[PDB]
Amino acid sequence: DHVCDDNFSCPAGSTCSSAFGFRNLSLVWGCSPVE
């Protein structure tokens, strides 16, 4: 399994959307399906 930032994970079955990159005061995103 993977692990982006901290509270997150994905069995290489998606990607870390990654959001809140203008200062990082909470970080809120999800995993995206590569296909």
Curated annotation (Swiss-Prot):
Inducing factors: By gibberellic acid (GA).
Glycosylation sites: N7
Expression sites by tissue: Expressed only in seeds.
Top-level taxon in the UniProt lineage: Eukaryota
Cysteines joined through disulfide linkages: C4-C16, C10-C31
Family under the similarity heading: Belongs to the peptidase C1 family.
Function of the molecule: Probable thiol protease.
Protein name: Oryzain beta chain
Section covered of the full-length record: 383 to 417 of 466
